[PDB]
A paper describes a structure:
Different AAF variants are expressed by different EAEC strains, where they are required for the bacterium's adherence to small and large intestinal mucosa. In the fiber, subunits are linked together by donor strand complementation (DSC) with an N-terminal Gd donor strand segment of one subunit inserted into the hydrophobic cleft of a neighboring subunit.
The minor subunits AggBdsA and AafBdsA have more similar structures than the major pilins: 117 matching Cα atoms are superimposed with r.m.s.d. of 1.2 Å. The donor sequences derived from the corresponding major subunits form classical donor strands (Gd), each inserting five donor residues into the subunit core structure. As predicted, the minor subunits have no N-terminal extension that could act as a donor strand: the first residue in the mature protein is structured and immediately followed by the first strand A. Hence, this structural evidence suggests that the minor subunits assemble by accepting donor sequences of the corresponding major subunits. As such sequences are only available in tip subunits of major subunit polymers, the AAF minor subunits are likely to be tip localized. Furthermore, the significant sequence identity with the AfaD tip invasin (>60%),which has been visualized as a tip subunit, together with the ability of AggB to functionally complement AfaD mutants are also suggestive of a similar localization for AAF minor sununits. A conserved disulfide bond also stabilizes the minor subunits. However, this bond connects the BC1 loop with the end of strand F and not the beginning of the fold as in major subunits. Interestingly, AggBdsA also bound to fibronectin but with significantly lower affinity (∼100 µM).
Numbering used by the authors:
A (entry chain C): 1 to 8, 11 to 56, 60 to 119, 125 to 142
B (entry chain E): 1 to 6, 12 to 17, 19 to 43, 49 to 56, 59 to 119, 121, 123, 125 to 142
C (entry chain B): 1 to 11, 13 to 55, 60 to 68, 70 to 120, 127 to 142
D (entry chain D): 1 to 8, 10 to 56, 60 to 119, 126 to 142
E (entry chain A): 1 to 8, 10, 12 to 56, 60 to 120, 125 to 142
F (entry chain H): 1 to 6, 8, 10 to 19, 21 to 32, 34 to 40, 42 to 58, 60 to 76, 78 to 79, ...
G (entry chain G): 1 to 8, 11 to 43, 47 to 55, 60 to 104, 106 to 120, 127 to 142
H (entry chain F): 1 to 7, 10, 12 to 16, 20 to 44, 46 to 56, 59 to 79, 81 to 120, 127 to 142
């Protein structure tokens, strides 16, 4: 429901290298989070390809306590919890030597609600400028 | 549509294993446990045994409808586990719960629930 | 020992807790906890400060962060062996903001279990522009 | 900090001190006293004004107890003691007058004063349509 | 006894946010004010849920200087005072999302009378206002 | 129908403060309580000394207590047995003495009944 | 210098559900208060049954602190007295007795710790 | 804007050494100790928990300064500058704790003080 993204990069990206950190925060009570990147999926759920702003970069989203998900019917990564905020990373997906410059894309996410469990009516979206 | 299923401390490992098979053309699989919610299965005859289902060719899923885990796929069979959710101890008595599952159909990657649902039982011998 | 700050835009009425800036403290070498502060005038409670325009702004730092003195250094603290921690610079109480810019200098360290302050300290600057 | 103005169609016959509109000023921050005024040409004493129709004139004053006229450097207005969070005020007919029907549109500004004592960096300002 | 309502227009609402603001005027002598919304209660008097025309806003009424009340035995919020008028708001009851559409707030109120020992008067006012989201 | 009460302080006192009260309603039943001095904020009070007619600003509740009129205080909904509460200072002030509070309370029932205790404090 | 403790029902535990309520009193002039629970731990704890429990301390005007190098919750004031709570945090269940050890100092601003330290024990009967 | 401070005998005649760094372009450095004055750059430090010890700051790459009412300064656009906090002459020191702090700013040609100053504290037994 509220998403903050912090940018950090250099061309040599090792696998699982942290490219950007993110935080999703929820103001109303909730059970669980899910997030995703608004880009073409590149293989497994949560892995993606993003274009240079004038060259490509393979990223993935998540980190500890996140794992891939399909939630009516939004593909992303999911983490359980009722806490107010959760941390996540955007990581390099594989070793890659990337062309310098800006890779701009957005991230979305929701604070899931409940006995049923449900997507809230509003999703957050924030844009990040990833600089290589 | 077709499911076959197979100490006092544990963290992390197996408790039962299983396969869901889907004879007809389909797009994915979809399974869960029928118990309170990752689940908590109530003792028979006060303590709470924590379990989870899947195995990570499986993904956390909410379809309609139903929470549980899923896997995209046109193949016939898919294997899964029933594990223990984190470190825990075990009180005596029996533990009884069940596993359901369905062969998902794509309308058109848009996974949807089919008419038939399989359910199998576990009376978990301690 | 590595800090990245971003600022939030918008707009004259700040509500208590409102996020002015967000930061990431990263520790690459193994460690036991984080430790951050603002280089700015103290204002009552430990993680609370006063920053000037060019009108002044009352702010606080943190968010699972605890007020702390470590070897006499005031700041906020969190236990953690994880690689990174996120923090905010927030409005302390309701107040207004004169248009203009407020410079926040933030410092931080990766504490080590044997608590001890390291010999290396990060320091970064972000400007809140109103 | 926050001003709301609600107007009582008033009719052309305006008796002295007749309520034409009701206002509220609300302060978040801790504060010592309130401070309000109309952005129009002063007309005699402090807190007394003339407003022109949106094509004749209307004579109004602001306050109504315990509001008192004030110069708070260097802003002329009317003023109220306290640390309470809102205070209510009136806009009144200043003297008996017979007024041409229609709209008299003007703004009202004000500040929460802070404790020793001084003005805050910004004032509030709201617009009222007085309908005769 | 006399009530005037103004409405304030995204999709979200923070706790305490003003959806509408109102005045209750009392010409005749009185020792208090007494208001409520005519809608399904929801928890504390006077907190309510309001239907969209098709979606539920939880709203609350009163604000600074209004205490929840139960007078003969009308539930609402109240305020002592002999002054001629009083300002109140209709506020978002917690953080929530707003389905678009129309919401009708129907507000009633009364100029309380004494014989400190407050009593309901013979006059009640009711006014309608439509919130647009 | 059951209240228990309890507190030095020294002259100095800010806002926010023991106090302490505690009303017990264990028969099938709401909770409101009050101090037995009208001062414009229900339920905020003023209590005179035992020398002449000094005085003190005071309020009751503290947490899940809202101001209310029910022709009587502050109040909390819930069906539990006890209803813990405090009484604090209404304003930071000086105070050169003994001030005594009558505290009352009731148990509110159904679809909206026929307890008074006294406490004293010292500064 | 001095701490005094008081217990309190049911077996279900939600959030902020008080469990005890103590009071701390430094006679000598001093700038503040400073208290914790002695249990393997933020100011939130786990206190075993003689299974477990999860618990928090402070409430009111109390905030998490770390003061050279004692983790607690603290507050300021020359006020010769201060009052606090030990309470639940979020939904949970509870199977007898629980003993909390509770300590506390009075701080100085010279904010530092004195040689004198209080410790009191209190029982949680459920 | 950025300083590193390296900082417990009854007798003495270097209590700490430190550097101030200035990453953004600037034209000089300005530092001082927070404590009662004694020349300018010379200070008298009291001990809470009576007596006092005379300290002085800099090291003669440093000149006595008063900039907008406030220590010692040094011209230069390089990124760093080193300084010492040394005992002001031979003196005796009774038991107790000696607390004080050092601050510095990066001066700009356009000289005058920037909005940012960094501070570091020293505390001493003997």
């Amino acid at each position: 429901a509220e998403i903050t993204l912090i940018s950090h990069l250099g061309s040599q990206l090792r696998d699982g290298m942290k490219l950007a950190t993110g935080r999703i925060a929820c103001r109303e009570p909730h059970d669980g989070f899910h997030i995703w990147i608004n880009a073409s999926q590149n293989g497994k759920v949560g892995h993606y390809i993003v274009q240079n702003n004038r060259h490509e970069l393979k990223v993935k989203i998540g980190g500890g306590g996140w794992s891939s998900s399909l939630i009516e019917g939004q593909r992303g990564v999911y983490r359980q919890g009722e806490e107010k905020q959760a941390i996540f990373d955007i990581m390099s997906d594989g070793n890659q030597y990337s062309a310098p410059g800006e890779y701009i894309f957005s991230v979305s996410g929701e604070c899931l609600i409940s006995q049923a469990l449900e997507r809230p009516p509003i999703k957050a979206t924030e844009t990040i400028r990833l600089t290589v």
